[PDB]
């Protein structure tokens, strides 16, 4: 696997540049990622994004990255999404496409609204091998699902990010910070968000109602099989009594990859809204110290 | 249930073991001047010595000099202020920074 | 009969427990290596006191109905145990608060418990879950009679933490979770029956369908009924001494009800005294600010024989608790707030589910390496 992901500064500022110009209302917009992986650390130095509609576009740029003596080895692909919801079958299908060429491959899912309200949200996650295991044998089947065991904690493992630069960027960071307009950093401690919290929970509620849809029919699949097992064992006791005196379709379940996909998606709501929870409650409790002298 | 007309005026004093123990009057009224301090902020000294079992003002000022009683005259008796025993366990009880930071470290 | 070998099998070991563990077993090595190599069960040192506490209550009722003065398991439990339990050099085991709840517990069968702050101090070892259900129920019922009623909300809330994470696995309560959890909420609800209505400690703990079963009882308290001393007493009646079994029932002379007149008849007359305060508290404050006309207006509205009713209005107002200073010039009574408290179980129910989410993941992550 990959234990560490690390960035150079060029990938992130062009990741903002596809949000800043290109799609503004809500767009899934997407790219490639770049770098070489020196041992136990995935080093990212570049990206180039893809517009909103392919491999011919992807491979033609690979000569271009070689023309200027820049690193040209594809590691993974990034995608912008809405507030907490990136988990789809389509990106995971487009991730195991790139898990197959190189043994290490990544999504850094950039969420532009969680940055604009607060902390930096790039989600650098990687595939667990046991979810690499089920697609290589191509058995999306419940009988091997328990032997090649997948339960939702190893559904997307997380690789931690460490920022790396050269020192001339630190010159240019020192150069810019003096010569600039004074941009105050106040937007972290905002202390009103209830629709950032509201659409976090409302996008969660339709998936639990999607989860409620999945287990209501799971009763009916058992209500299909609990009649049919006894009806065929009635047909066992019907037909076995018949030949002594002389001398059908079983249903499929709901196909169980979507039931694991909803729990891992509700896993994305659970980590973020509770990290959202003390985030606002910290600025609430520092504001207890702000009113504290005023009589 | 604070019956004193039986205890001081209808008491059968035929047994000498009540005087056989020393200071039964000073002990059981020490129980009784304790319990009156909760329940009064103004009472007259005529109705005071009636419920304390018929001793005069010649001793009533001596026992009240002991226990934090002033005679604010005609007839009132000073025990304590007003504002102690409204006793709010009030609406403004709070959740502190340290009372929830046990759970706030793991969700973060 | 058929129970005489039940004592005699186990007390032959309990004879040894004063003999071995107090006199000689500080350097005793040979019984230890018999207990490591031979047997199959490891927890016998918590079996050997606590199952002996069971079997001696099985024969205290047997012996005291056949011998009144100086009974034989009154001797072997009571007159052997207490100095032999604590005093020796360090018994580095789980017996630390276990042995004092026998020592307070044999101080509890006879009613003379006065020792709550001294055994609170002396402990340096951790607590057993079997210990924790008995010790708040012992000292809380001690405080039920010793009348620390504004701390009796604190002692009976402490027992009701309710997180079991169940450990059975071979009867490790023993037999005593569901009976005693029925017991400690009942006197807690009987605290809300006696001390109306200051807890507000069972309202945030448990559902409202059970609290209406006592809710039929506590509205009988208020004005009129003689069974309210009796429902308080008879539902405490298996909880005063808890006797388990007679072996010999002969009623010609009875000779078992002479220990019953020891505890039960003199314990019942004080349960008449318990709801007397509830008749002091038979006016919940609905009119609490008055002139001197409406104190005497309260004298005739409460009952007749209104002047002088202050000789019996003081009898109607003074049992332990009632606080207001009266005026004589303008006649102002005082008013003491019945004020709401607010939701702290939103915090606690995070800690309820976060211990359950980790432990349902803790126990069953072993399952993923037990069978796969």
Swiss-Prot record, chain A:
GO molecular function, one term: metal-dependent deubiquitinase activity
Gene3D superfamilies in the cross-refs: Cytidine Deaminase, domain 2
Residues recorded with modification Phosphoserine: 141
A Gene Ontology biological process term: formation of cytoplasmic translation initiation complex
Alphabetized UniProt keyword annotations: Cytoplasm, Initiation factor, Isopeptide bond, Phosphoprotein, Protein biosynthesis, Ubl conjugation
Lipid metabolism among keywords: no
Pfam families, A to Z: eIF3h_C (PF19445), JAB (PF01398)
Chief location: cytoplasm
Alphabetized HAMAP family for the sequence: eIF3h
This protein's name: Eukaryotic translation initiation factor 3 subunit H
Designated gene of the protein: EIF3H
UniProtKB/Swiss-Prot annotation, chain B:
Name of the gene: EIF3K
Molecular function per GO: ribosome binding; RNA binding; translation initiation factor activity
BP terms from Gene Ontology: formation of cytoplasmic translation initiation complex; regulation of translational initiation; translational initiation
Family listed: Belongs to the eIF-3 subunit K family.
Sites of Phosphoserine modification: 107
Assembly and interaction partners: Component of the eukaryotic translation initiation factor 3 (eIF-3) complex, which is composed of 13 subunits: EIF3A, EIF3B, EIF3C, EIF3D, EIF3E, EIF3F, EIF3G, EIF3H, EIF3I, EIF3J, EIF3K, EIF3L and EIF3M. The eIF-3 complex appears to include 3 stable modules: module A is composed of EIF3A, EIF3B, EIF3G and EIF3I; module B is composed of EIF3F, EIF3H, and EIF3M; and module C is composed of EIF3C, EIF3D, EIF3E, EIF3K and EIF3L. EIF3C of module C binds EIF3B of module A and EIF3H of module B, thereby linking the three modules. EIF3J is a labile subunit that binds to the eIF-3 complex via EIF3B.
Coiled coil: none
Localization (cell): Nucleus; Cytoplasm
Tissue-wise expression: Ubiquitous, with the highest levels of expression in brain, testis and kidney.
The protein's name: Eukaryotic translation initiation factor 3 subunit K
Top-rank lineage group of the source organism: Eukaryota
Chief localization: nucleus
Alphabetized UniProt keyword annotations: Acetylation, Cytoplasm, Initiation factor, Nucleus, Phosphoprotein, Protein biosynthesis
A GO CC annotation given for this chain: cytosol
Keyword Cytoplasm: yes
Cited function: Component of the eukaryotic translation initiation factor 3 (eIF-3) complex, which is required for several steps in the initiation of protein synthesis. The eIF-3 complex associates with the 40S ribosome and facilitates the recruitment of eIF-1, eIF-1A, eIF-2:GTP:methionyl-tRNAi and eIF-5 to form the 43S pre-initiation complex (43S PIC). The eIF-3 complex stimulates mRNA recruitment to the 43S PIC and scanning of the mRNA for AUG recognition.
From Swiss-Prot, chain C:
Compartments in which it is found: Cytoplasm
Origin superkingdom: Eukaryota
Chief location: cytoplasm
Modified residues (N6-acetyllysine): 285, 369
Parts of the chain that traverse the membrane: none
Any one Gene Ontology molecular-function term assigned to this protein's record: RNA binding
GO biological process terms held by the UniProt record: formation of cytoplasmic translation initiation complex; translational initiation; viral translational termination-reinitiation
Keyword RNA-binding recorded: no
GO cellular component, one term: membrane
Domain PCI: 151-357
Keywords: Acetylation, Cytoplasm, Initiation factor, Phosphoprotein, Protein biosynthesis
Family affiliation: Belongs to the eIF-3 subunit L family.
Subunit structure and binding partners: Component of the eukaryotic translation initiation factor 3 (eIF-3) complex, which is composed of 13 subunits: EIF3A, EIF3B, EIF3C, EIF3D, EIF3E, EIF3F, EIF3G, EIF3H, EIF3I, EIF3J, EIF3K, EIF3L and EIF3M. The eIF-3 complex appears to include 3 stable modules: module A is composed of EIF3A, EIF3B, EIF3G and EIF3I; module B is composed of EIF3F, EIF3H, and EIF3M; and module C is composed of EIF3C, EIF3D, EIF3E, EIF3K and EIF3L. EIF3C of module C binds EIF3B of module A and EIF3H of module B, thereby linking the three modules. EIF3J is a labile subunit that binds to the eIF-3 complex via EIF3B.
Its job: Component of the eukaryotic translation initiation factor 3 (eIF-3) complex, which is required for several steps in the initiation of protein synthesis. The eIF-3 complex associates with the 40S ribosome and facilitates the recruitment of eIF-1, eIF-1A, eIF-2:GTP:methionyl-tRNAi and eIF-5 to form the 43S pre-initiation complex (43S PIC). The eIF-3 complex stimulates mRNA recruitment to the 43S PIC and scanning of the mRNA for AUG recognition.
Record's protein name: Eukaryotic translation initiation factor 3 subunit L
Gene this protein is translated from: EIF3L
Whole-protein coverage range: 181 to 552 of 564
């Amino acid at each position: 696997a990959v234990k560490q992901v690390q960035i150079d500064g060029l990938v992130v500022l062009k990741i903002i540049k596809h949000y800043q110009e290109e799609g503004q209302g809500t767009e899934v917009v997407q790219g490639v990622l770049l770098g070489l992986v020196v041992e136990d650390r995935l080093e990212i130095t570049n990206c180039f994004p893809f517009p909103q509609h392919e491999v011919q576009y992807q491979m033609e740029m690979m000569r271009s990255l070689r023309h200027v003596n820049i690193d040209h080895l594809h590691v993974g692909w990034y995608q912008s999404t809405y507030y907490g919801s990136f988990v789809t079958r389509a990106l995971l299908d487009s991730q195991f496409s790139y898990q197959h060429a190189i043994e290490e491959s990544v999504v850094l899912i950039y969420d532009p609204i969680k940055t604009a309200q607060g902390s930096l949200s790039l989600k650098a996650y990687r595939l667990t091998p046991k979810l690499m295991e089920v697609c290589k044998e191509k058995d999306f089947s419940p009988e091997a699902l328990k032997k090649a065991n997948i339960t939702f904690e190893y559904m997307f493992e997380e690789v931690p990010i460490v920022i790396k630069n050269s020192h001339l960027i630190n010159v240019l960071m020192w150069e810019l910070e003096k010569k600039s307009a004074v941009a105050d950093k106040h937007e972290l401690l905002s202390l009103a968000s209830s629709n950032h919290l509201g659409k976090n929970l409302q996008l969660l509620m339709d998936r639990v109602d999607e989860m409620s849809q999945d287990i209501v029919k799971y009763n009916t699949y058992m209500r299909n099989t609990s009649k049919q097992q006894q009806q065929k064992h009635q047909y066992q006791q019907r037909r076995q009594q018949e030949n002594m005196q002389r001398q059908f379709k079983p249903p499929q379940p709901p196909a169980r990859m979507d039931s694991l996909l909803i729990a891992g998606q509700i896993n994305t709501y659970c980590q973020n809204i509770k990290e959202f929870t003390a985030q606002n409650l910290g600025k609430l409790f520092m504001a207890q110290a702000l009113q504290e002298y005023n009589n | 249930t604070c019956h004193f007309q039986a205890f001081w005026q209808a008491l059968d004093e035929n047994m000498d073991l009540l005087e056989g123990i020393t200071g039964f009057e000073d002990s059981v009224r020490k129980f009784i001047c304790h319990v009156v301090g909760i329940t009064y902020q103004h009472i007259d000294r005529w109705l005071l010595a009636e419920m304390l079992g018929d001793l005069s003002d010649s001793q009533l000022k001596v026992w009240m000099s002991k226990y934090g009683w002033s005679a604010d005259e005609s007839g009132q008796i000073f025990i304590c202020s007003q504002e102690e025993s409204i006793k709010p366990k009030n609406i403004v009880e709070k959740i502190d920074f340290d009372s929830v930071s046990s759970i706030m470290a793991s969700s973060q | 009969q058929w129970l005489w070998d039940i004592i005699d099998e186990f007390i032959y070991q309990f004879q040894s427990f004063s003999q071995y563990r107090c006199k000689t077993a500080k350097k005793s090595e040979e019984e230890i290596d018999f207990l490591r190599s031979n047997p199959k069960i490891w927890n016998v040192h918590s079996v050997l006191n606590v199952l002996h506490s069971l079997v001696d209550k099985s024969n205290i009722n047997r012996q005291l109905e056949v011998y009144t003065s100086g009974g034989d398991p009154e001797s072997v439990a009571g007159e052997y145990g207490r100095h032999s339990l604590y005093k020796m050099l360090g018994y580095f085991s789980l017996v630390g608060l276990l042995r004092l709840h026998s020592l307070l517990g044999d101080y509890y069968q006879a009613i003379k418990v006065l020792e709550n702050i001294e055994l609170n101090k002396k402990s340096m070892y951790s607590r057993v879950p079997e210990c924790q259900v008995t010790t708040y129920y012992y000292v809380g019922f001690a405080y039920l009679m010793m009348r620390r009623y504004q701390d009796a909300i604190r002692v009976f809330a402490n027992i009701l933490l309710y997180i079991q994470r169940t450990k059975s696995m071979f009867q490790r309560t023993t037999y005593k979770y569901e009976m005693i959890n029925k017991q400690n909420e009942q006197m807690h609800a009987l605290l809300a029956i006696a001390l109306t209505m200051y807890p507000m400690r069972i309202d945030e703990s448990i559902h409202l369908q059970l609290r209406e079963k006592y809710g039929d009882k506590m509205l009988r308290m208020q004005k009129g009924d003689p069974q309210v001393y009796e429902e308080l007493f008879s539902y405490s009646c298996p909880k005063f001494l808890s006797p388990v079994v007679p072996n010999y029932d002969n009623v010609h002379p009875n000779y078992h009800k002479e220990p019953f007149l020891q505890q039960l008849k003199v314990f019942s007359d004080e349960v008449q005294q318990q709801a007397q305060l509830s008749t002091i508290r038979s006016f919940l404050k609905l009119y609490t600010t008055m002139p001197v006309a409406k104190l005497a207006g309260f004298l005739d509205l409460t009952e007749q024989e209104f002047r002088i009713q202050l000789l019996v209005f003081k009898h109607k107002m003074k049992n332990l608790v009632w606080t207001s200073g009266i005026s004589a010039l303008d006649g102002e009574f005082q008013s003491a707030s019945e004020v709401d408290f607010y939701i702290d179980k939103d915090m606690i129910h995070i800690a309820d589910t976060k211990v359950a989410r980790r432990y349902g993941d803790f126990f069953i992550r072993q399952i993923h390496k037990f069978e796969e």
